[PDB]
């Protein structure tokens, strides 16, 4: 019966094209079993300087392995990675890192762009136990109150790491719909490995976007679907002012080392426990401290610090597509446009507008690294009026 | 061996309901087989360790014999579905507790069969009834004493869902599924779906099918059987 | 007499393995293992099909060919060796009359079909179908009705033989009653089953039965219809866990008539699935302890996972005569005796106790502890029809004239390693020979005498002391359970005299080596404690994370390899990938425990596992040694010099 039967699901797939060739085809639908889902994009409107909250369902659906040896390692391991990626897209956000645990919420980190701050907070966020339920209603009031005396010219988006469980809390939470809907503030979770209806409700009533992890690979895909400044609802804002443009200073300007260290608890600037010697300068306060590239505390405005942040998404919208190709057009001496080689997978990857002959290698190296093709350079610049 | 002869047999009813109850989330309305056998069926529950981690997973509806209270916690189905809380309602399949719901996928997406849904109880209203389709069609006791449990089963079981993507996870705890599940399924369900290589699944290794179930079933959905113009097909 | 099935074939046609010359199916294997790997991938790589020996695995690019049959392929192969993704080295053995689902033919395609017409020597081809699949019901009628098969073309030979040696031949209350015995159908084509031969023949036929080239299989209808009488089993909340759910999937993957053995690793759930057996089979069921050690063991988790104890308990060895007057379930252990009149009316009652046990379940751990002088005592005292082997040894006592399927019929599961040491709760242990430079006052007496005394002289030595004194204060760091199990008595005596911990020896009162047991396994102050030669073996199952060992002398791989194998339990609820549990020898440098070691190390990769030699501490002098100077260490060397013989010996 099942003996046999336990060997009926193994014979088959052992076997394949007999004589010669064997085990040959086998390998070939495992190259046919790639190739996933590739951008989708194309979008406009909205996405701009994202105020994200980090949410964390910490329960005991940790203890499955499911992925990993924990959910938290499937997790937390990939969020630093996702803190770093995110870091190096948008730098012009800030991301609130708030922990449930034990149907409370810990907002573990406070809304900032620190990185070392937040990725030491995760491997601070390593051993831990993750007892007792999950509550969001405690996490959307610290979302709320916080986000709440932040500006309406602000994104207000809320990333939540939920395992899927039951939604264990009080309070009319099916209001908090119309409370925040109000407030204009996103909310977006993923399940893990599985669905919350009313959280899928939730998300649906919100317009943040709920997805359920799949796998480890899947579960980088949505991560990196939300690294991108989504376009969210309409009628949020349109300016944001005073962008204080700072001063790099060297300290060694006029006077040559008139002062032994510029942080001696009366020098404007000189904000967090440390000994500095003079290396930034905000417009405002005239606030002297580590460098940073975000903001203040007493001056209060944004120290943009614009070929890193406004440089960011400053080209992350107007991109284009190529196309593909399966002939033999042979442009070049059976080159490519870009790196000058040849393999042909019958992917000749087109541009749209200049035309350029690509490869795989070239192409992910635009749509992944480069972000553009340098071939409508020589073809947009010359012309450009 | 009974709904009271052995409760060895029901040291494992619950196994195959908290990991249903773990997985599953949303709601369930499971079919019990009367009332004295739901009384049977929660009497090891509470003196014996059960509800220990059933409670602390989702919440419980019992059904009352008194149709009063029976349509509390119907009351409360609705909502403790709808709120931060899966809430599994617990009912009896003969009962009329079984008609008038149209479970959506809002609430209500999933049954698990307890037993051979027959009648069991009412004494030589049977064999009169018996003898005159034997005196119909004369081979009709090992027929339609099948057919009766399965006529209930599917108006009980196949409710769960309405439109065409509102899901069902519709799983056969049963031992008597050889022929007569078989037959009394649908032709159109025995066919794609019933035991396509699954058959004697203990629960432990079913656990993982409704998680590879559920996990792809709740994505991608866009485009599902588009019908515009008529382009024949011909079924 | 007549216990003869197909013994392990490879003994000859073979000369100088090196077969650079002539490897002549292995060319036919090494051409389509050649001519096949050009374009990128290998379609090719038999499992390098040896004809002698065993073959080897490929799984290096297994990706969905060998990697699927990383698994599926070992049937016949053990696996012996285990490793990282690379090749894969097994044995080969009895493992087709478990293979029963399948024809030793169709293996004979994929063996081809895996290795590309890499061929066979035929080695395995005189050895394929040298029994045929066939099983042994014990249907309603109180013996068995006499089953051949799914397929018919075996009575052909049979019913020409057997015969002509030994014949064969209210209402809705009721109703479902027949729906049952509805369900009694073909036995999935057919079944071709003959009546008993009066019971007492089978005996007789038996040994016939394999007499001409089929072997059989005894089952155990025992669930769906039973005549006699059943007890009341219940398992009582006894959550349990995907390794051992498996177990009884292979053990009842048919209908309710088929007998089991499976292999668990050490510490495993031994004593679950058996009382998992004991309650979902409905039977009255039968434990063989190896010791009253195990006695007191089996039944407690039976305590706690059944509650069927209501006087319901019966063990049965070293004057414990609990509840001989009524037989449910029992534990026995195996009566050895032979002897005049060992035990007058009481292994009298083991022998009429187990005429009433009638059959039962043989429950039987760790079978490479039994001698075959003992198996023939296990077939000829107990006449069962269920067997159930719990051992962890795959081969043992180099006894390749005697398998162990005759004895018990197929070996049906083992459980591995990396899906429970990896993925599963079985902690992962470092390994550590660590050998220290003695002080050579130690060693020119050694090469001097040539008298036991020698023996003695590394034992004692505060080099061993320095390596012992120290991982006690390393791991009292990390707040965890540690054991130390040395050689003899009065060596240990003096580190429980110097760094004094809880410790015991032979004739300790077994109140207070419990109490030590209530202050080590409970209480978590002192995480420490020594041990001796008795307490692993005859009074406890430490429960541990942590283990040093001194005794190195003699050859028992195992027997010292599965006492690691069941005291190192998980150390924390480590949330890190390492290894957690810990093993620890110490050994002399150039001598017998320097080579005993070499071969010990040689066994240790021979099953393979996370071993380290380390020699230096992590900063030794970073602790308060005691014996820094030396002249203390003569202290000790002239009570050394004192010292006699009867220091220097074990329990045997
Ligand atoms: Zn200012
Ligand atoms: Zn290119
Ligand atoms: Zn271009």
Request: neutral net charge; charged residues 25%; proline residues 4%.
């Amino acid at each position: 019966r099942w003996e046999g039967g336990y060997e009926r699901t193994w014979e088959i797939l052992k076997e394949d094209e007999s004589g010669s060739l064997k085990a040959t085809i086998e390998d070939i639908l495992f190259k046919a079993k790639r190739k996933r889902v590739f951008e989708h994009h194309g979008q406009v409107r909205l996405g701009m300087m994202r105020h994200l909250y980090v949410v964390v369902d910490g329960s005991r659906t940790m203890e499955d392995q499911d992925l990993k040896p924990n959910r938290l390692t499937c997790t937390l391991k990939l969020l630093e990675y996702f803190v770093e990626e995110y870091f190096d897209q948008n730098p012009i956000s800030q991301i609130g890192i708030i922990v449930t645990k034990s149907k409370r919420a810990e907002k573990l980190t406070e809304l900032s762009g620190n990185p070392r701050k937040h990725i030491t907070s995760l491997k601070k966020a390593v051993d831990m136990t993750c007892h007792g339920e999950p509550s969001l209603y405690n996490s959307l009031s610290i979302a709320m109150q916080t986000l709440k005396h932040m500006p309406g010219h602000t994104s207000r988006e809320v990333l939540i790491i939920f395992s899927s469980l039951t939604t264990c809390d009080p309070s009319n939470i099916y209001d908090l719909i119309k409370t925040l809907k109000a407030a204009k503030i996103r909310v977006s979770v993923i399940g893990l490995s599985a669905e919350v209806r009313v959280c899928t409700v939730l998300a649906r009533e919100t317009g943040g976007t709920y997805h359920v992890i799949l796998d480890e690979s899947h579960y980088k895909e949505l991560l990196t679907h939300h690294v991108s400044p989504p376009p969210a609802s309409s009628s949020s804002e349109c300016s944001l002012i005073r962008m204080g443009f700072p001063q790099h200073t060297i300290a060694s300007l006029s006077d040559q080392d008139a002062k032994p260290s510029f942080s001696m608890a009366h020098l404007d600037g000189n904000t967090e426990p440390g000994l500095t010697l003079g290396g930034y300068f905000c417009p405002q306060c005239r606030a002297k401290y580590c460098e940073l590239p975000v903001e203040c505390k007493i001056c209060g405005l944004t120290l943009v610090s614009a070929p890193h942040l406004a440089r960011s998404y400053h080209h992350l919208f107007p991109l284009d597509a190529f196309q593909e190709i399966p002939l033999e057009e042979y442009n070049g001496e059976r080159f490519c446009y870009g790196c000058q080689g040849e393999l042909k997978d019958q992917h000749v990857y087109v541009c749209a507008v200049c035309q350029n002959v690509f490869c795989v290698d070239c192409d992910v190296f635009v749509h992944d690294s480069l972000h553009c093709c340098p071939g409508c350079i020589h073809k947009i610049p010359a012309p450009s009026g | 061996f009974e709904t009271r002869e052995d409760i060895a047999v029901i040291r494992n009813y619950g196994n195959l309901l908290l990991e249903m109850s773990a997985v599953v989330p949303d709601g369930i309305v499971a079919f019990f087989t009367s009332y004295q056998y739901m009384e049977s069926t929660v009497a090891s529950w509470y003196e014996q360790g059960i509800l220990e981690n059933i409670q602390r997973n989702k919440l419980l509806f019992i059904e009352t014999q008194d149709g009063a209270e029976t349509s509390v916690a119907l009351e409360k189905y609705q909502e403790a579905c709808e709120n931060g809380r899966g809430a599994i309602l617990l009912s009896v399949a003969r009962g009329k507790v079984s008609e008038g719901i149209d479970f959506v996928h809002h609430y209500g997406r999933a049954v698990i069969m307890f037993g051979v849904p027959y009648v069991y109880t009412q004494s030589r209203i049977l064999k009169a009834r018996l003898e005159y389709l034997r005196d119909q069609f004369q081979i009709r006791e090992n027929d339609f004493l099948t057919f009766d449990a399965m006529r209930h089963a599917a108006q009980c079981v196949g409710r769960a869902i309405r439109g065409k993507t509102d899901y069902g996870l519709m799983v056969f705890a049963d031992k008597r599924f050889a022929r007569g599940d078989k037959r009394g399924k649908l032709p159109r369900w025995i066919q794609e779906h019933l035991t396509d290589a699954n058959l004697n699944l203990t629960v432990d290794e079913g656990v993982q099918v409704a998680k590879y179930f559920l996990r792809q079933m709740a994505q991608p959905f866009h485009r599902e059987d588009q019908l515009g113009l008529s382009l024949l097909s011909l079924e | 007499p007549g216990n003869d099935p197909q013994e392990a074939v490879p003994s000859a046609a073979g000369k100088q393995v090196d077969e650079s010359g002539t490897k002549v199916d292995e060319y036919g294997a090494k051409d389509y293992r050649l001519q096949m790997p050009l374009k990128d991938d290998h379609t090719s790589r038999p499992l390098w099909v040896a004809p002698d020996g065993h073959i080897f695995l490929e799984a290096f690019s297994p990706v969905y060919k060998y990697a699927q049959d990383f698994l599926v392929a070992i049937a016949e192969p053990v696996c012996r060796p285990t490793h990282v993704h690379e090749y894969k080295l097994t044995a080969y053995s009895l493992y087709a009359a478990v293979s029963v689902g399948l024809q030793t033919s169709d293996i004979t395609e994929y063996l081809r079909k895996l290795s590309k017409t890499g061929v066979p020597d035929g080695i395995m081809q005189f050895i394929k179908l040298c029994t045929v699949s066939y099983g042994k019901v014990k249907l309603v009628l109180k013996h068995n009705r006499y089953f051949v098969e799914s397929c018919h073309p075996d009575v052909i030979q049979h019913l020409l033989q057997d015969p002509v040696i030994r014949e064969c031949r209210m209402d809705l209350f009721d109703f479902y009653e027949q729906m049952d015995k509805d369900e009694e159908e073909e036995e999935e084509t057919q079944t071709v089953s003959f009546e008993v031969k009066q019971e007492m023949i089978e005996e007789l036929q038996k040994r016939c039965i394999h007499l001409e080239y089929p072997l059989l299989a005894e089952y155990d209808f025992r669930n769906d219809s039973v005549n006699p009488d059943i007890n009341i089993d219940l398992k009582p909340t006894a959550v349990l866990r995907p390794y051992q759910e498996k177990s009884l999937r292979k053990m009842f993957g048919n209908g309710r008539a088929r007998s089991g053995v499976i292999v668990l690793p050490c510490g495993a759930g031994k004593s679950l699935v058996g009382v998992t057996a004991a309650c979902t089979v409905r039977k009255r069921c039968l434990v063989l302890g190896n010791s009253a050690v195990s006695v007191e063991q089996w039944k407690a988790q039976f305590k706690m996972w059944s509650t069927i104890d209501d006087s319901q308990i019966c063990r049965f060895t070293s004057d414990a005569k609990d509840k001989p007057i009524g037989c449910s379930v029992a534990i026995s252990t195996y009566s050895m005796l032979g002897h005049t009149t060992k035990r007058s009316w009481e292994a009298e009652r083991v022998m009429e106790w187990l005429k009433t046990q009638e059959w039962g379940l043989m429950i039987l751990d760790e079978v490479h502890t039994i001698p075959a002088k003992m198996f023939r005592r296990v077939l000829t005292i107990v006449q069962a029809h269920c067997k159930l082997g719990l051992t962890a040894t795959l081969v043992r006592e180099d006894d390749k004239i005697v398998d162990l399927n005759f004895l018990i019929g197929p070996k049906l599961y083992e459980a591995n390693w990396m899906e429970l040491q990896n993925n599963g709760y079985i902690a992962k242990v470092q390994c550590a020979e660590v050998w220290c430079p003695m002080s050579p006052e130690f060693y020119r007496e050694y090469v001097a005498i040539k008298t036991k005394k020698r023996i003695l002289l590394y034992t004692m030595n505060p080099n061993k002391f320095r390596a012992c004194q120290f991982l006690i204060k390393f791991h009292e760091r990390r707040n965890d359970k540690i054991i130390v199990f040395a050689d003899n008595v009065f060596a240990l005596k003096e580190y429980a005299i110097r760094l004094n911990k809880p410790y015991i020896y032979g004739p300790t009162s077994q109140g207070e080596r419990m109490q030590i047991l209530q202050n080590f396994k409970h209480n978590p102050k002192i995480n420490t404690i020594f041990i001796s030669k008795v307490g692993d073996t005859s009074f406890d199952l430490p429960e541990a994370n942590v283990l040093i060992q001194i005794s190195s002398h003699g050859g028992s791989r195992r027997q010292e390899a599965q006492r690691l194998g069941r005291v190192l339990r998980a150390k924390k609820g480590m949330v890190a990938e390492e290894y957690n549990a810990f093993f620890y020898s110490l050994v002399s440098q150039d001598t017998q425990e320097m080579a005993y070691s070499t071969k010990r190390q040689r066994f240790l990769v021979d099953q393979g596992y996370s071993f380290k030699v380390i020699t230096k501490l992590a900063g030794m002098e970073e602790e308060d040694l005691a014996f820094s100077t030396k002249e203390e260490q003569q202290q000790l060397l002239q009570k050394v010099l004192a010292a006699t013989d009867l220091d220097a010996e074990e329990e045997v």
